[PDB]
Design brief:
The complex is a heterotetramer of chains A (7), B (139), C (372) and D (747). Helix content of chain A is 0%, strand content 0%. With 7 residues, chain A is low in regular secondary structure. The radius of gyration of chain A is 4 Å and the shape is flat. Chain B contains nine helices and two strands. The two termini of chain B are 22 Å apart. Chain D has 747 residues and is an alpha+beta fold. Chain D has a domain of 113 residues: Methane Monooxygenase Hydroxylase, Chain G, domain 1 (Up-down Bundle), CATH 1.20.58.530. Chain D is 45% helix and 15% strand. Chain D contains 25 helices and 23 strands. In chain D, a hairpin with a 5-residue loop joins strand 1 and strand 2. The two termini of chain D are 52 Å apart. The chains are: A little secondary structure (7), B mainly alpha (139), C alpha+beta (372), D alpha+beta (747). The interface between B and D is medium-sized, with 33 and 26 residues. Bound molecules: phosphoaminophosphonic acid-adenylate ester, adenosine-5'-diphosphate and magnesium ion (MG) (2 copies). The site of adenosine-5'-diphosphate has 18 residues of chain C, from helix 6. The PDB classes it as motor protein.
């Protein structure tokens, strides 16, 4: 993703 | 009309009086006018008569004095020729066609009147010289 | 005439085809392989990279990337390869000639739609395109205007209610659990039985094991008692090399983590409690008619017995006096594609496309306002 | 002025659609009208309108309806009435169109001497007759060697078959002989039995367009006939509205059933079966269907279809009827099954040589193939019923096409055809109290046919103008295309109809709603009925027609699952069934789409050709010889589009005269001041005087073209002049007879 999760 | 004319017309009127009371019927008035040299249409005759009903036209009787204003009112060539040239272009007219149009158009006449007027005026082919017939009937 | 292309990026499998027919004529994994080992032989025709079924055929030597993780496109340079391969190799069609329809999960980052549009207009010169929610397309697929759609593929799980064709955006739930992180859990339990699968190729072996042997327990504790007390439950699978592996409680234990995500260690509750919480976020007048239609979609819902496990525990949550009906057609793996195949063939939908004129006028920002 | 004392006018009447009057007072401009009738009346001019003003009697009864110097419903109806009743003529020309009135009586006119009398003439030469159109076709072909169409239209029973028969009899008589005519005529009882149905208004209505081609060799002798068919009304096979039957063959078959061979088919009575039962009306007055069966089999035998094939056809029709009784029990909202040992399906399999277990499986399931993988999944009772009815329709349409191909095999002959003349029996524009998908398709085909007619007549008028050296821009044109685009364009009525079939939980209610959203204020020809939400109105070329939405989705749905026909193809019990099927997207097409394609193939076949037109009308409801009813005739002149052809012609220049015939009539009119040695310039001077404006009339090379009003006005003034002359003559003649009578009175 951009913050929380990895993608 | 002068006194002489009124006297001649009254005498003629009295010749048409078939009852002796000095009167004619309304329906004879037109006939008397025609006998005196006028050529009014049936419409003109009924108009000067006041568009009479059948009953008074056939049985009401008028003397010369009442007839006279009507004669006055009615009283007060090239078209005739063109009218005949309508039905022609060798200057002739079939007798059958002239008979049909005179007995079926306009103020229709009887077949006997047409036979009477046409007698001796048609040639062997059955053609009428209309200029001669017109001059003849106008003389 | 001219006929829309219909494409679903998903995660894992790509599935693509022409609108107005009944199943996709290209299906292949969205996978890019690059060769890592030293190449010795000279004049072998050795190649930059492989896509889809090529990469899995040769996957011994390769490293396998997935460019889409959790329904987000993480790498674009691979994804352009995957689309290029789909249109030219898989469909053998020039994309100038056909409008294209593209598919996405809800609540994913805005810029995913911008870039996914920009690449389709600028590089392919696709004459018009639309981007549609997976869940919405599953209703067109199953033939309803009403229902709560539970959808899980690889990557993202999401729930959307729809009532007579009005979506209820405040009640959409999304969960990252499904599909890949079941397999990453299955690796870790298989290690407990003495087998170790690390490489990206072994991850594809585990994924095939999962697809063959897993099934959802009707009661998890009863069946764990049975599998402890018995060998009756135990099944064996032959690895590609001909070694043979034998699997007990692990096969039901793996998909149970969909219902108890605490096993992998996520915060949130399982798919049933997000389904019930989603209905709870709907206004009380509709709820009966969402309980009366529940539509499962995408391949992670294919596990045997998952339907009756849902109906059983949702019934236990729900008010007692109501129908709970779970609808799960056997076709459901392709439902999102079939629904987009239906949608793109409607006549009303031909006004809906983003056309190239509109992109030139507005730039890719238009996709937000024109599309859902 | 237009209205005068002693004019005549038409005024409306309930008993006979128009009654005549004389106008008893001249018009004065304003509200009140005094009329005298065939007996005394007063009438209001106001709702402005003035009543249609009657033609002069010299024009009444003329062979050409455009010779009339007023054109109206009443003037046309009167000309046809007097020509039929007094002349006992049945043929009349309107413009290019020939109008044919069914006499229900034999006439001597068809004799071979009259056939030879028509041969080689032009049309204008000779008094109207059906032979004149075939003669024009034949010589147009001889000259210019484009193939020829002759097109015959009107409600069936207006005589379209006998109008074809005489054209065949003409070509066979003139060209020399090859026995086509008798063999083609012998085809009719089968193509009727498969193609004709009862309807609420009618019996033996042909529900399909039948195109016969007559072929010619390089001598222009008859080689042979070819036959094609178009626009089959497939939906009638599975559905009927109240007081309609299915196609005759189903009933003729049912009435056979007790006869020895058909016993093997286990047929019930005519209303045992779902497809025959629905309409209400298994029996017809004056038709013995069991008798007509014999004539059908005999017409098979004379065209060389053996009883081996004949019992195949009747087995297939028993197949369809038994199939219709198959009935589904729903075992879920999403699934259904055929209840065990279902007797209709048992008999259907025993007839068709297929396994009960695979029909029963495939009827309740449908099958989908990914490239690697295939899924077999259930379908609702509603889709199962739809798919069964689509199978029954698809069998029927294939059987019909096979019987047509075998008749083509009988009729074809070896010689390579140099050219053909082709004769089209097709149904006319139609309206009933209730209108439905059948009427919507019939009226759309009749709008394409009307668009051809209207454009061909326009083109011929541009030719006729420049042959007479007149500027085309005077010529006006009228266009169906706004309505055609309304029906068939993208976002049209048929488009959204085919959309609502695929849509999830589409229905007639949401379809009607989609129509009202798309068109209701945005298009001029589409109108919602004031008090209903389930109907719409189309303004057609002839008329406004109100359609109910209620049926269309269940009639327009067609899809056929491949697995069912892939079962039927397997059948090795009897020869014909795989011969029919052996023949992919088309199996998904709706009925409205298959109809629109069949209509495009028809319109291609006609646009290749040069047409000629015949229109037929059925003058009384009850087949009385040489009796006429104005109230049917006014209907059928609309149903044949004649009255819009008349409204088109009455604007512009409907009246045409040759200078010599004009001068022949009107020497009477003009005085010798103005006659010239050029009659043409003479007549130009005459009209320069006697009509105020050239805007009403034009001069060309050989003819004067007048707007509708002008000639009757001239006939007024000519007749009144003629009577003026008569009056003066006859009064003078009578006056001279009074002079003679006065001379007798003196004697
Ligand atoms: N010129 C004519 N001479 C004699 N009878 C005629 C003529 N025109 C029509 N008919 C009659 O019209 C009736 C019905 O016309 P016809 O077309 O023969 O009926 P059909 O066989 O059902 N064909 P159709 O109803 O038009 O599909 C028959 O009884 C014919 O005899
Ligand atoms: N028949 C099956 N049984 C169980 N799991 C499956 C099955 N088929 C696919 N899967 C798993 O589900 C995921 C693929 O689902 P899919 O619907 O193709 O994803 P997407 O919707 O992103 O295309 C993968 O993790 C795959 O292992
Ligand atoms: Mg007929
Ligand atoms: Mg007949």
């Amino acid at each position: 993703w951009x913050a929380x999760c990895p993608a | 009309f002068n006194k002489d004319q009124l006297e001649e017309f009254k005498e003629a009127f009295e010749l048409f009086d078939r009852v002796g009371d000095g009167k004619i019927l309304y329906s004879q008035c037109g006939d008397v006018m025609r006998a005196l040299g006028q050529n009014p249409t049936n419409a003109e005759v009924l108009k000067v008569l006041g568009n009479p009903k059948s009953d008074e036209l056939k049985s009401r009787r008028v003397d010369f004095e009442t007839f006279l204003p009507m004669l006055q009112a009615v009283a007060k060539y090239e078209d005739y020729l063109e009218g005949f040239r309508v039905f022609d272009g060798n200057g002739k007219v079939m007798g059958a066609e002239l008979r049909h149009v005179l007995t079926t158009l306009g103020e229709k006449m009887t077949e006997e009147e047409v036979e009477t007027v046409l007698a001796g005026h048609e040639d062997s082919n059955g053609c009428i010289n209309y200029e001669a017939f017109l001059k003849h009937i106008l003389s | 005439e001219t006929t829309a292309l219909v494409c679903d990026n998903g995660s894992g499998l790509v599935k693509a085809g022409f609108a107005g027919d009944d199943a996709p004529r290209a299906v292949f994994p969205s996978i890019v392989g690059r060769p890592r080992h030293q190449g010795v032989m000279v004049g072998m025709g050795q190649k930059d990279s492989y896509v889809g079924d090529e990469a899995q055929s040769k996957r011994g030597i390769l490293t396998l990337k997935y460019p889409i993780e959790h329904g987000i496109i993480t790498n674009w340079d691979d994804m352009e390869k995957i689309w290029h391969h789909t249109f030219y190799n898989e469909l053998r069609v020039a994309p100038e000639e056909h409008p294209t329809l593209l598919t996405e999960a809800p609540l994913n980052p805005k810029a995913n739609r911008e870039k996914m549009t920009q690449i389709m207009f600028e590089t392919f010169n696709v004459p018009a395109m639309y981007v549609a929610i997976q869940a919405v397309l599953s209703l067109y697929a199953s033939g309803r205007t009403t229902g709560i759609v539970l959808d899980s593929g690889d990557g993202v799980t999401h729930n959307v209610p729809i009532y007579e064709g009005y979506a209820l955006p405040h009640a959409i739930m999304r969960l990252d659990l499904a599909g890949r992180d079941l397999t990453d859990y299955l690796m870790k339990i298989l290690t407990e039985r003495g087998y170790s699968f690390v490489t990206t190729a072994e991850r594809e072996i585990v994924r095939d094991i999962k697809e063959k042997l897993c099934y959802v327990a009707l009661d998890f504790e009863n069946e764990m008692a049975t599998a402890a007390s018995s060998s009756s439950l135990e099944k064996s699978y032959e690895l590609p090399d001909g070694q043979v592996i034998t699997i007990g409680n692990e096969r039901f234990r793996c998909p149970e983590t969909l219902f108890q995500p605490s096993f992998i260690g996520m915060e949130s509750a399982g798919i049933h409690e997000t389904t019930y919480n989603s209905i709870m976020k709907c206004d009380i007048d509709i709820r009966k008619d969402l309980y009366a239609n529940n539509v499962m979609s995408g391949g992670t819902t294919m596990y045997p017995g998952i339907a009756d496990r849902m109906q059983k525990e949702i019934t236990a949550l729900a008010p007692s006096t109501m129908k709970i009906k779970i609808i799960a057609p056997p076709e459901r793996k392709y439902s999102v594609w079939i629904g987009g195949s239906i949608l793109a063939s409607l006549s009303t939908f031909q006004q809906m496309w983003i056309t190239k004129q509109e992109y030139d006028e507005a730039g890719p920002s238009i996709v937000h306002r024109k599309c859902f | 002025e237009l209205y005068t004392k002693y004019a005549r006018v038409w005024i409306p009447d309930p008993e006979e659609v128009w009654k005549s009057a004389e106008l008893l007072k001249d018009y004065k401009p304003d509200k009140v009208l005094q009329l005298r009738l065939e007996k005394d009346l007063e009438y209001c001019l106001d709702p402005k309108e003035l009543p249609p003003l009657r033609n002069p009697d010299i024009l009444v009864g003329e062979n050409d309806l455009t010779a009339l110097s007023y054109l109206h419903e009443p003037a046309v109806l009167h000309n046809l009435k007097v020509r039929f009743i007094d002349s006992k003529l049945i043929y009349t020309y309107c413009g290019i169109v020939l109008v044919a009135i069914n006499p229900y009586e034999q006439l001597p006119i068809y004799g071979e001497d009259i056939i030879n009398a028509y041969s080689g003439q032009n049309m204008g030469d000779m008094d109207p007759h059906i032979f004149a159109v075939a003669e024009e076709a034949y010589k147009q072909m001889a000259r210019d060697e484009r193939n020829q169409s002759i097109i015959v239209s009107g409600e069936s029973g207006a005589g379209k078959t006998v109008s074809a028969k005489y054209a065949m009899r003409y070509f066979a008589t003139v060209s020399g002989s090859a026995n086509v005519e008798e063999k083609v005529l012998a085809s009719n009882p089968i193509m009727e039995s498969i193609g004709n149905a009862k309807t609420t208004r009618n019996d033996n209505s042909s529900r399909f367009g039948k195109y016969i081609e007559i072929g010619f060799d390089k001598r222009y002798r008859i080689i042979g006939a070819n036959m094609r068919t178009y626009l089959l009304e497939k939906s009638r096979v599975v559905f009927q509205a109240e007081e309609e039957r299915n196609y005759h063959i189903f009933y003729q078959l049912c009435a056979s059933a007790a006869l020895p061979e058909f016993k093997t088919l286990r047929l019930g009575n005519a209303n045992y079966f779902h497809y025959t039962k629905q309409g209400g009306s298994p029996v017809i007055d004056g038709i013995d269907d069991a008798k007509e069966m014999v004539n059908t089999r005999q017409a098979c035998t004379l065209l060389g279809i053996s009883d081996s094939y004949q019992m195949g056809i009747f087995r297939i029709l028993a197949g369809i009827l038994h199939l219709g009784n198959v009935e589904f029990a729903s075992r879920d909202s999403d699934s259904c099954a055929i209840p065990p040992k279902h007797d209709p399906l048992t008999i259907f399999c025993d007839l068709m040589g297929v396994d009960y277990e695979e029909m029963a499986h495939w009827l309740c399931h449908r099958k989908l193939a990914t490239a690697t993988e295939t899924y077999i999944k259930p379908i609702s009772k509603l889709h199962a019923i739809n798919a069964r009815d689509a199978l029954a329709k698809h069998i029927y349409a294939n059987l019909f096409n096979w019987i047509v191909d075998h008749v083509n095999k009988a009729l074809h002959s070896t010689v390579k055809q140099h050219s053909f003349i082709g004769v089209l029996d097709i149904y006319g524009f139609e309206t009933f109290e209730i209108n439905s998908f059948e009427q919507f398709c019939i009226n759309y085909a009749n709008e394409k046919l009307q668009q051809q007619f209207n454009m061909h007549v326009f083109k011929l008028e541009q030719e006729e103008y420049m042959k007479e050296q007149i500027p085309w821009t005077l010529i006006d044109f009228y266009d169906n295309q706004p309505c055609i685009n309304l029906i068939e364009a993208k976002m049209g009525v048929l488009d959204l109809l085919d959309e609502e079939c695929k849509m999830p939980k589409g229905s007639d209610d949401t379809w009607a709603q989609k129509l009202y959203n798309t068109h209701l204020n945005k298009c001029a020809l589409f109108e919602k009925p004031r008090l209903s939400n389930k109907a719409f109105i189309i303004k057609h070329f002839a008329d406004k027609v109100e359609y109910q939405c209620e049926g269309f989705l269940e009639k327009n749905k067609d899809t056929v699952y491949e697995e069912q026909i892939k079962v039927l193809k397997s059948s090795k019990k009897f020869k014909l069934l795989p011969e029919l099927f052996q023949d992919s997207k088309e199996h998904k097409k709706t009925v409205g789409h298959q109809f629109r394609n069949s209509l495009h193939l028809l319109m291609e076949t006609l646009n290749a050709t040069t047409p000629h037109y015949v229109r037929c009308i059925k003058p009384n409801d009850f087949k009385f010889p040489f009796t006429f009813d104005e109230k049917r005739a006014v209907q059928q002149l609309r149903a044949c589009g004649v009255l819009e052809t008349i409204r088109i012609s009455a604007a512009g220049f409907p009246s045409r005269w040759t200078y010599q015939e004009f001068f022949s009539r009107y020497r009477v009119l003009m005085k010798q001041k103005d006659v010239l040695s050029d009659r043409k310039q003479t007549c130009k001077n005459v009209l320069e005087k006697l009509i105020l404006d050239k805007d009403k009339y034009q001069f060309g090379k050989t003819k004067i073209f007048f707007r509708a009003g002008q000639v009757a006005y001239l006939e007024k003034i000519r007749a009144d002049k003629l009577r003026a002359a008569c009056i003066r003559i006859q009064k003078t003649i009578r006056g001279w007879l009074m002079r003679k009578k006065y001379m007798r009175m003196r004697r």
